[PDB]
Amino acid sequence: KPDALIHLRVPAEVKGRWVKESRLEGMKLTDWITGRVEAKALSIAEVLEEAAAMARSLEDSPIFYRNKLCADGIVTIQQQAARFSAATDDATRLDAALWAREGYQLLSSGLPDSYSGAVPNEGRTGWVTASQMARLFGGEALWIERCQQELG
Amino acid sequence: DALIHLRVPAEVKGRWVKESRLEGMKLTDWITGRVEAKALSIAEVLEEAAAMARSLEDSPIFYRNKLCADGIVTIQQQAARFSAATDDATRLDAALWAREGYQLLSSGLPDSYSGAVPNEGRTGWVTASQMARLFGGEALWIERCQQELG
Amino acid sequence: AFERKLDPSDALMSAGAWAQRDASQEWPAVTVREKSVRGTINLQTVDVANLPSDADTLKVRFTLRVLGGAGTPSACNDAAYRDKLLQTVATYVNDQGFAELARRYAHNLANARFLWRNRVGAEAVEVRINHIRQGEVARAWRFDALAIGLRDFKADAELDALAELIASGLSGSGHVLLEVVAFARIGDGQEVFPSQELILQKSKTLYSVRDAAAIHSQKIGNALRTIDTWYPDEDGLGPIAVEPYGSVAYRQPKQKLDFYTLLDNWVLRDEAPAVEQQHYVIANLIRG
Amino acid sequence: ILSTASVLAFERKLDPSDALMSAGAWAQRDASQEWPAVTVREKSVRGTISNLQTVDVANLPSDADTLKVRFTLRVLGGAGTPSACNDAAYRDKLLQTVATYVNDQGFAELARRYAHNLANARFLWRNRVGAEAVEVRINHIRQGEVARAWRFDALAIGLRDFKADAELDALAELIASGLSGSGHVLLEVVAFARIGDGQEVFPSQEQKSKTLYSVRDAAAIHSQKIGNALRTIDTWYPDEDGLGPIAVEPYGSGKAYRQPKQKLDFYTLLDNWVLRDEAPAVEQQHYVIANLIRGGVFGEAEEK
């Protein structure tokens, strides 16, 4: 792939202090900021916890009983998510994470495609929650490739 | 105002944009907060401590004695009081109080187990270890709270 | 009348990279696959549509043509009735004009409401609308779908220009043809949402044209006709789709505000409806 | 007919000392003398919201990241010889039985497992968990000066299965020589656990509840607790022997593993071994002599 560029407009003192700390840490500035953002940024493990929390929130919402696909996906995200924290074998984790989105995919394929009025009642459509879950997991190929790279 | 130019792969930028949109902030502000990270945050420390307190709460160590249950409830209560605060004084008192809850739990925990490795549900040693790493030393945590909030 | 006046097309989907959308003709179409998904602790089957791993934006393209002569029916009615119906529609067009309906139609075109679920969770949505005459484009419009509201009709120079063009189409002064492209920056390799078809095994089959994902024309028309803010006792609530009974937020038949009651009282009893309600009547006349 | 002694007691053969605690810096552990002792203070702690409990707390100084826990373990000979008995025939037969074991086996296995529990720093009951690195120094002190030294990575050897090691087998052989009767052995055992700059250390226990144990205003693990950690040797209990070793108790004590229904308990084994001349499995021979080495008051309060 080709690389991409990111431009940071920050106060002058912030840039000077970052340059000082980076020179102290023995790395190039871009690498320093990259490691510092990655460290705290996100977790593969963390995502499942969230997605399960949103699924349990949906469980007490009308979208849970719209059709079998939504309920099955919610229950699956939780079930598989739980399985994932039981540890001691990365093989299962790789399986549980792929299952996790697989449950999500089920929920998103069970969600409606049209609503009435101006804005959807989030309880009856769950589109924003599904958007958040799609952001958490990412693309199908992206999430699968991440899981195979991390837990391969 | 000054600018910094970042050479990163496209996948890294895509992941960063996804996380930024997820958290509801712009990319520059997001990465700025990440680069002024400073590892653990007094608030994230208390939040993780409350999570660990809940995980121990739904287990047998919760019913071992009054010290363990009181410590669990105290950690959670003080984290909740810290998050819903408005003045740095209440935040400071809540953080100190929260550790006092960890200390109560840790002095209520057993000192011996049976078998090779301890059953975490009945001993709670690994969870207490992780939250003790979160808080740090007693004097260290008190000094940190007094520097940040005092 | 029951002859469709706002005739849309199926909106075909394609995938590409944002900021490369200016040359979007080459963009490969979004394919719909049929995957197996693991169920609750067991393999169900579902249709799924995704973008390639190197594409972050969805191009949804359709063609909408606006035709004139709304009051002229298609059913061979008793001529005496049709004379009065045509007279009523003509007196409306003279007195009021299509300006309000056309502006609201152009609003629903520009806000990208036709991207029913594809609009939510998108980083940025942009609508290009080209008035096409002959084999080339007569005029061009570019809109920020998220910037313009989804519950607000406000005046804008370029949007009022599109409104005037749609009014030219509806008035009968010549049928107008628009190509409508929507670019939604949904996310590198994310999920796109084509129209669903209830499978009455497969659970719910996705709609596709020539191995390309698409939103059905009826759904685009439903999105287009979210015009009426004249239903009883709901100011802040956004417009709903124009139906005869206005079911969903509903124009109850008992209330004189229903389409059939109003139209019959207007043409037969010569009782002119409310000004706001006139549009509702001619709007579902345009719907067909 | 031979009957078990009405009174039969044994004396501790693996005699440990109280393990004194001190605090220091990791990179100074080679010169670990004079390290200030970890003191136990009593702090006041606030509890639940509906109020001040008081608890004993032991912490390292704000400038110390490593805990030094030091004790002295002395190995004595003569395991089978009781301290109080009242049947000459039973004690004679018991001496014959234990002598036949010591001849055939020689304490090698038990000594290897005891040296494992010394080297893994298992005696650091809670101080071992959450430690960045734990290291065990073991010196075979003779005159008052070291005769041989051992350095071990407590986390590397773990706490799940006794494995053969070149340096550890030397300590095992020394402990076996001590137990055999070829000379009492004296070892000083120091453990360095990098538990964390200013963290909490955990001495043995027993308004305020659960007061911490201290000797001469210094935090310490009780000798009995160290002995409990030392004898987590038995991997021979009747079910699930792979899940790890437990401590050697008469009924394997969380119900009893060595149940007198499976007959594998200490008392049944010893009775069948001594009185009836039907020696158990070699492994159980290890178990019987292990709780003989531990010492206690066994015997029959009422005839069988």
Helical coverage of chain C, percent range: 25-40%
| Number of beta-strand segments of chain C | 13
Strand content of chain C: 25-35%
Tell me the helix content of chain A: over 70%
- Mind telling me the C-alpha Rg of chain A? 20 Å
Biggest sheet record of chain A: none
**Helix and strand element order of chain C:** EEEEEHHEEHEEEEHEEHH
Largest interface: A-C, 38 and 40 residues
- Rg from Cα of chain C: 21 Å
Outline of chain C: globular
Measured between the Cα atoms of the first and last residue of chain C, the distance is: 6 Å
Count of spatially separate domains of chain A: 2
Number of helical runs of chain A? 8
Explain what you see.
The complex is a heterotetramer, with 2 copies of chain A and 2 copies of chain C. Chain A has 152 residues and is mainly alpha-helical. Chain A has 2 domains: 12-41; 44-151. Chain A is built from 8 helices and 1 strand, in the order βαααααααα. In chain A, helix 4 runs antiparallel to helix 5 and helix 5 (90-110) packs antiparallel against helix 8 (140-151). Chain A is globular and about 60 Å long. Chain C has 288 residues and is of the alpha+beta class. Chain C has 2 domains: 1-3 and 70-97 and 227-288, no CATH class; 4-69 and 98-226, no CATH class. Chain C is 26% helix and 25% strand. Chain C is built from 6 helices and 13 strands. In chain C, the strands form 4 sheets. In chain C, strands 1, 2, 5, 6, 7, 8 and 11 form a 7-stranded antiparallel beta sheet that branches. Chain C has a two-stranded antiparallel sheet with strand order 3-4. Chain C has a two-stranded antiparallel ribbon with strand order 9-10. In chain C, helix 2 (99-110) crosses helix 3. The longest helix of chain C is centred in the N-terminal third of the chain and has 17 residues, at 79-95. Chain C starts with 5 loop residues before the first strand and ends with a helix. Chain A binds chain B through residues 1-12, 14-15, 18, 29-30, 32-34, 36-37, 39-42, 132, 135-136, 138, and chain B through 1-13, 15-16, 18-19, 21-22, 27-28, 31-32, 34-37, 39.
